[PDB]
Write a sequence for this structure.
C-alpha cells in the first residue's frame, strides 16, 4: 500500500499523466476472501505503466548513460583537451569569476573534439 | 586542439602515406565532399585530428608533400581522391625533378629551399589555434625522403623546440646489399639526428614486414603496394586515442610518455596481430578476450626483427597494448593477470615492468566493430641486435672502398665516417647498460 501510493505521487508530480492504471479502473476490488491478489496485480500493473514511461519518453536509459559518461571520464578525449585549457585558469590565484570563463572554455573543446551530441553536453555546469 | 602536421616524405614514404589517407575516410564515417553520413559525428569524435576544422564541411589534410621524384606526389593527385587534397596548404602544385637518387641531393635542397619549405606548414597552421607538434612520416629508404627528412629533424627542434618530434622511420631492406648498397651510409646518418634531436622514434624494419605478410595474407609474393597496406593499418592503429576515447593515454604526448625510459633507448618494437584472412571464421563465434592479448607479447606478429635465442636474455620495461572496439571490457584486467603467470612480460633486474592497457569504442565500420584489434607498441631491450647487424655491415663496407668517394659527389668533402661508427656503438651500450 505504501509503495503503490508512492508511484501514484510520481504521477501527481508529473503532468503527462495523473494516474498509473487505465485498465484496473474498469475493475473495482472490495475483496476480503481474496484481498491479496487484487492488491498485488494493481501493484505490478502500476509498476509496468511506469517502467515503460521512464524507458521510452523520459529516456532514463540515455539519462544514466550520460551521467555515467562524464564523471568517470569516458569521453576521455574531450576531458584531456579541456583540462589543458583548465590548467591555464589555475595560473590565476582563485577568484569568483572562474566558472563563468570555464563554462565558456567548455564549448570550445566540445566542438574541437566534436562529441556525439553537443547540446546534451551543455548541461555540464562547472562549479568553482 | 591537438593539431598535427604530418610530414609525409620519400619515395616509399609518400606511398605509405597515400594509403594512410585512404584508411581514414572509411573509419571517420565520411564521404570526401561533406558530412552526408550522420555516423560521422556520433561514431568518430574529433574529425580534425589530421584535418582542419569545418568551414562548410570542407576538410583539408594536414600533410605536406615534397619529393625529388614528381611521380610519387603525382600518384596522390591522380588517384580516385583529389579534391580531398587541396594543393595550396599542402604543397605548391608542380614540384620539379631532383638531380637525384642520392642522400646528399635532398640534404642541400633543404638549405636552399628553406624559405619555401617552412612556409607551407604555416599555410595550414593558420587554422591551428595551438599546434601539438609534427610527426615526421619520412622513409630512410630512398635518398629522396631521407635527404629532406634529415633536414626537418634539426630545424623543427630549434624553431619549434616545444613541439612533438616523433618519426615513422621505415628502414631500407637489410637482405639487400647488392641493390641498395647505399644502405649503411644513408640509414646511419638519419639515426644520428634521431638520437639527439628526437626523444622517441618508432622503427620498422622492412625484412620483418614480409615475415608477417605471407604468414597472414598468404600472398604468392609481397610487392611494393602490397607492403604499403600492412603499414597504413599500423599508422592508423597507433593514433586511435586521439580520435576515439580512452581514459588511458588519450593524448599522443600521453602515448609516447609511457614508452621512453631514457634518451638513447626508445627504439620501439611494434607488433600487430589481426591480418589473417580466416579471422573471419573465428569472429563469428567469438575467440574470447582472455587469449587475444596473450598472443601479442608472444612473437608471431612482430615488425621489428629479433632472434628467438635472445628473448630470455633481454626484458621489456614498458609495453603499451591498445585494444580497439568492444572486447568485453571487464576481463581485460583478468587477461593481463595471466601475463605474469606465463611470464610473457619480462621484468628488469632492479625493478618492475608496466603494461599500460587502453581501450576504445569505435565508429561503424565492420572490420573493426566486430573484429578485435590489438596493437602493441613495446619498448624491449633486445633492439641492439639490429644495431649489431648494421654495424657489422657498415665497417665491412668501408673496407670495400665503395661510397667513400662516390657518396662525396655532393656536399660531403669531409670525413664524418667515423662519427657514424661511434654514434652507433654509444647507442648500443646505453641500451645494454640500462639493465643489469
Amino acid at each position: 500500500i505504501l509503495s503503490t501510493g508512492k508511484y501514484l505521487n510520481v504521477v501527481r508530480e508529473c503532468g503527462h499523466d495523473v494516474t498509473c492504471p487505465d485498465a484496473k479502473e474498469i475493475t473495482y476490488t472490495l475483496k476480503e476472501q481474496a484481498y491479496v491478489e487484487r492488491i498485488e496485480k494493481a501493484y505490478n500493473y502500476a509498476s509496468k505503466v511506469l517502467l515503460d514511461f521512464l524507458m521510452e519518453e523520459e529516456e532514463l536509459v540515455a539519462h544514466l548513460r550520460s551521467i555515467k559518461h562524464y564523471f568517470l571520464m569516458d569521453q576521455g578525449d574531450f576531458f584531456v583537451h579541456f583540462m589543458d585549457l583548465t590548467e591555464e585558469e589555475l595560473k590565476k590565484p582563485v577568484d569568483d569569476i572562474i566558472p563563468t570563463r570555464l563554462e565558456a572554455l567548455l564549448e570550445l573543446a566540445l566542438r574541437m573534439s566534436t562529441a556525439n551530441t553537443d547540446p546534451f553536453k551543455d548541461d555540464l555546469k562547472i562549479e568553482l | 586542439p591537438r593539431e598535427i602536421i604530418t610530414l609525409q616524405l620519400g619515395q616509399c614514404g609518400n606511398q605509405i602515406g597515400f594509403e594512410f589517407w585512404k584508411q581514414l575516410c572509411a573509419e571517420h564515417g565520411i564521404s570526401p565532399e561533406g558530412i552526408v553520413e550522420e555516423f560521422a559525428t556520433e561514431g568518430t569524435d574529433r574529425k580534425d585530428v589530421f584535418f582542419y576544422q569545418a568551414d562548410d564541411e570542407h576538410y583539408i589534410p594536414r600533410a605536406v608533400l615534397l619529393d625529388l621524384e614528381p611521380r610519387v606526389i603525382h600518384s596522390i593527385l591522380n588517384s580516385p581522391y583529389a579534391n580531398l587534397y587541396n594543393p595550396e596548404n599542402i604543397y605548391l602544385s608542380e614540384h620539379g625533378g631532383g638531380a637525384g637518387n642520392n642522400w646528399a641531393s635532398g640534404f642541400s635542397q633543404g638549405e636552399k629551399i628553406h624559405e619555401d619549405i617552412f612556409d607551407i606548414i604555416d599555410r595550414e597552421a593558420d587554422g591551428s589555434d595551438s599546434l601539438e607538434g609534427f610527426v615526421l612520416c619520412h622513409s630512410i629508404a630512398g635518398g629522396t625522403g631521407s635527404g629532406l627528412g634529415s633536414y626537418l629533424l634539426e630545424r623543427l627542434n630549434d624553431r619549434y623546440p616545444k613541439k612533438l618530434v616523433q618519426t615513422y622511420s621505415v628502414f631500407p631492406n637489410q637482405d639487400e646489399m647488392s641493390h641498395v648498397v647505399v644502405q649503411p651510409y644513408n640509414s646511419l646518418l638519419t639515426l644520428k639526428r634521431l638520437t639527439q634531436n628526437a626523444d622517441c622514434v618508432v622503427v620498422l624494419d622492412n625484412t620483418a614486414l614480409n615475415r608477417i605478410a605471407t604468414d597472414r595474407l598468404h600472398i604468392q609474393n609481397p610487392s611494393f603496394s602490397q607492403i604499403n597496406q600492412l603499414v597504413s593499418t599500423i599508422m592508423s592503429a597507433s593514433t586511435t586515442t586521439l580520435r576515439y576515447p580512452g581514459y588511458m593515454n588519450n593524448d599522443l604526448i600521453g602515448l609516447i610518455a609511457s614508452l621512453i625510459p631514457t634518451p638513447r633507448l626508445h627504439f620501439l618494437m611494434t607488433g600487430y596481430t589481426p591480418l589473417t584472412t580466416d579471422q573471419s571464421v573465428a569472429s563469428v563465434r567469438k575467440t574470447t578476450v582472455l587469449d587475444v592479448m596473450r598472443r601479442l607479447l608472444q612473437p608471431k606478429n612482430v615488425m621489428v626483427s629479433t632472434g628467438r635465442d635472445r628473448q630470455t636474455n633481454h626484458c621489456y620495461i614498458a609495453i603499451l597494448n591498445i585494444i580497439q572496439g568492444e572486447v568485453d571490457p571487464t576481463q581485460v584486467h583478468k587477461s593481463l593477470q595471466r601475463i605474469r603467470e606465463r611470464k610473457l612480460a619480462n621484468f628488469i633486474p632492479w625493478g618492475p615492468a608496466s603494461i599500460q592497457v587502453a581501450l576504445s569504442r569505435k565508429s561503424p565500420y565492420l572490420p573493426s566493430a566486430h573484429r578485435v584489434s590489438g596493437l602493441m607498441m613495446a619498448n624491449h631491450t633486445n633492439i641492439s641486435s639490429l644495431f649489431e647487424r648494421t654495424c657489422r655491415q657498415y665497417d665491412k663496407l668501408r673496407k670495400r672502398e665503395a661510397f667513400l668517394e662516390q657518396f662525396r659527389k655532393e656536399d660531403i668533402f669531409k670525413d664524418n665516417f667515423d662519427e657514424l661508427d661511434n654514434s652507433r656503438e654509444i647507442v648500443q651500450q646505453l641500451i645494454d647498460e640500462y639493465h643489469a
Q: What stands out?
A: Chain A touches chain B through 16 residues (CB under 8 Å). Residues 35-58 of chain A form the longest helix (24 residues). Chain A has six helices and no strands.
